[PDB]
Tab-separated table of C-alpha atoms in Angstrom:
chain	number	residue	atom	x	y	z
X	1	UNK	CA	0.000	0.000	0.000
X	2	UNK	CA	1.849	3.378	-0.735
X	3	UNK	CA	-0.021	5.804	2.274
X	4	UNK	CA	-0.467	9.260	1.490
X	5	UNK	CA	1.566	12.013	3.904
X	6	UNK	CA	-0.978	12.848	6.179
X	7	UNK	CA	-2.255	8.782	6.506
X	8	UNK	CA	0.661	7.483	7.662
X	9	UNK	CA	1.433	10.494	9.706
X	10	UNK	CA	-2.074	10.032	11.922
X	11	UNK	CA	-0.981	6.183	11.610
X	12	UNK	CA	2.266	6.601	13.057
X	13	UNK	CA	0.745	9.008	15.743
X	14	UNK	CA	-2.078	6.281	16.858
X	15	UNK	CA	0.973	3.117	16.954
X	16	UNK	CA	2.845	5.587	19.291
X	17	UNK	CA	5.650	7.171	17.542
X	18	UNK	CA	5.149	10.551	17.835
X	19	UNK	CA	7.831	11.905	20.490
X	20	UNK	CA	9.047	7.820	20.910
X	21	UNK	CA	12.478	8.484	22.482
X	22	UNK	CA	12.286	12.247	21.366
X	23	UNK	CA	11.817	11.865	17.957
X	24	UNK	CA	8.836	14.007	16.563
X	25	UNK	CA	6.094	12.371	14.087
X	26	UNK	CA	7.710	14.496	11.684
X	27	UNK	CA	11.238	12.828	11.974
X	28	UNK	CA	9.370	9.434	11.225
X	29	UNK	CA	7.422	10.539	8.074
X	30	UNK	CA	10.454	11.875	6.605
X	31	UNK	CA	12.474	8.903	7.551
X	32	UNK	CA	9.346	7.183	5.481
X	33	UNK	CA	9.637	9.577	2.583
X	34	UNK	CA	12.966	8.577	1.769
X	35	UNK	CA	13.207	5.345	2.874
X	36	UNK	CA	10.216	4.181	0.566
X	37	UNK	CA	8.769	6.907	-0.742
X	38	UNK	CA	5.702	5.609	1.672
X	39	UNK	CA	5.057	2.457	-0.333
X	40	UNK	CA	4.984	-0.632	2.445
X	41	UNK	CA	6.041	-3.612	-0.605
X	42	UNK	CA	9.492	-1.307	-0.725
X	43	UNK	CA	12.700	-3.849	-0.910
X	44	UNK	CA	16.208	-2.957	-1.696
X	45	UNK	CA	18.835	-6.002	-1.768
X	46	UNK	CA	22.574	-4.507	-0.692
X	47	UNK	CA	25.810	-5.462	-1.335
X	48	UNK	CA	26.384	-7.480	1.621
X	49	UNK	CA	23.189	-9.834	0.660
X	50	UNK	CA	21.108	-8.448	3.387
X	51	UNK	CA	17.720	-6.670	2.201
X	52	UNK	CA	15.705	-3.386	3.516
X	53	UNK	CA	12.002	-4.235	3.579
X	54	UNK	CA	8.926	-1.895	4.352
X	55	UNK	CA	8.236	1.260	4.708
X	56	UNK	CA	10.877	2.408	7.131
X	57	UNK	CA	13.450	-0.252	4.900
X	58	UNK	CA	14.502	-2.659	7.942
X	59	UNK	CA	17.877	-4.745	7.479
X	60	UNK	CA	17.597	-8.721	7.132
X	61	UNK	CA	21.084	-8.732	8.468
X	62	UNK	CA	19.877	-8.016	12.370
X	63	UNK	CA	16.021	-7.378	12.507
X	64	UNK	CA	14.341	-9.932	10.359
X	65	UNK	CA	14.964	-13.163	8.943
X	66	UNK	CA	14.151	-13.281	5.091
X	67	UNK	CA	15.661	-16.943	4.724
X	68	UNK	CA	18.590	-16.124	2.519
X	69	UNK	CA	21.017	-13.439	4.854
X	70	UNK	CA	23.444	-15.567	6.206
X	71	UNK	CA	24.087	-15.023	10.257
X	72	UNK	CA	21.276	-13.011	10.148
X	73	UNK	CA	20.100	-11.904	14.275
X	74	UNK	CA	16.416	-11.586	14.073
X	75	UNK	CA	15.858	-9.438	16.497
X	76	UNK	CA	12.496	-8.666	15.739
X	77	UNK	CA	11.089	-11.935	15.655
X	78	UNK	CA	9.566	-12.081	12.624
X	79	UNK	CA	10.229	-12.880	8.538
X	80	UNK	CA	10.857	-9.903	6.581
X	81	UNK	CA	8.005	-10.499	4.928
X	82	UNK	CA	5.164	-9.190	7.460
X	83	UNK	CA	6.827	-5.773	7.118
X	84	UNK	CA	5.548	-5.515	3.239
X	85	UNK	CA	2.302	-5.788	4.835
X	86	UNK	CA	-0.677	-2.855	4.552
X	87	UNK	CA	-0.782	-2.762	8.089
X	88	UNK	CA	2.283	-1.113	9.425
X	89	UNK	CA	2.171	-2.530	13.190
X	90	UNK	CA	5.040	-4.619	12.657
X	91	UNK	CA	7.549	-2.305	10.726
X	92	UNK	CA	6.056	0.360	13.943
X	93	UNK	CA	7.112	-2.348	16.336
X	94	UNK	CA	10.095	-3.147	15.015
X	95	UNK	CA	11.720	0.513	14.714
X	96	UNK	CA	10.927	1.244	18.058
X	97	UNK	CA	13.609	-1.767	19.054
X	98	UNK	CA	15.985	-0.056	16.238
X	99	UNK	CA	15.883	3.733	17.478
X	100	UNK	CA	16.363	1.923	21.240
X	101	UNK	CA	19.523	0.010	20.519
X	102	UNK	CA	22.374	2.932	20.999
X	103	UNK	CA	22.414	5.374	17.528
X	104	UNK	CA	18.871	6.621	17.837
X	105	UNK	CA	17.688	7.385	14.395
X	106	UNK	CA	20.403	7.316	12.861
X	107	UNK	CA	20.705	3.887	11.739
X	108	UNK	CA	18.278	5.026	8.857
X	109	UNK	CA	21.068	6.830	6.456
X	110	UNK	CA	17.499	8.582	4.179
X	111	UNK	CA	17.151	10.033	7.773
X	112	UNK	CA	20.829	11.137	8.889
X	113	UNK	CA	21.445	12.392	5.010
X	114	UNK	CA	18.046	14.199	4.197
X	115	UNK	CA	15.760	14.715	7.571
X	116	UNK	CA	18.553	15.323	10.198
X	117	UNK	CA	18.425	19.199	11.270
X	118	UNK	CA	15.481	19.908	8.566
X	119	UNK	CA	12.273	21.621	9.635
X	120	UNK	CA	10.925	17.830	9.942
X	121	UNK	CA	7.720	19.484	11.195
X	122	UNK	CA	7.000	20.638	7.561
X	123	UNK	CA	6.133	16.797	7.103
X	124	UNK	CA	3.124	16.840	8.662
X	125	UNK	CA	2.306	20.565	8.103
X	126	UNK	CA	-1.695	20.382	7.340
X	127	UNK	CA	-2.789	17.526	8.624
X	128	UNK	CA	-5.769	16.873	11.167
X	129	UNK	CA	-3.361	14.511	13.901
């Protein structure tokens, strides 16, 4: 499903990620944005064989196990696969493990390289949250 700006922001907002570990709803939508370009089938494979699946693009190397990424943790407990899905409570669930583990947000490179120290708040500029 590819959500429109203002969707996924009032989605986001209602799974609890607006403000999770400081980060406004705006940080997340742009992290979105550039990470998918808000379409939830997104995949990417990389050059180490690991894949980025979903809307926010999570690694098969640590946080899900896609069946073909050697060594792969999955420390998300699921297959790579329910993060494609419509419903983003899993990708949601997920990222909040990924902005916990040490680096904050800044293990998404879209959202180091394009959202970092923008007026995120632009992003949801408009919409009825």
């Amino acid at each position: 499903k590819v959500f429109g700006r203002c969707e996924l922001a009032a989605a986001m907002k209602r799974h609890g990620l607006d403000n999770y570990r400081g980060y406004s709803l705006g940080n997340w939508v742009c992290a979105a944005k550039f990470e998918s370009n808000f379409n939830t089938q997104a995949t990417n494979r990389n050059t180490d064989g690991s894949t980025d699946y979903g809307i926010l693009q999570i690694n098969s190397r640590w946080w899900c196990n896609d069946g073909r990424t050697p060594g792969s943790r999955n420390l998300c407990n699921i297959p790579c696969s329910a993060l494609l899905s419509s419903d983003i409570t899993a990708s949601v669930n997920c990222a909040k493990k990924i902005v916990s583990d040490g680096n904050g947000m800044n293990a998404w490179v879209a959202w180091r390289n394009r959202c970092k120290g923008t007026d995120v708040q632009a992003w949801i500029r408009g919409c009825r949250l």
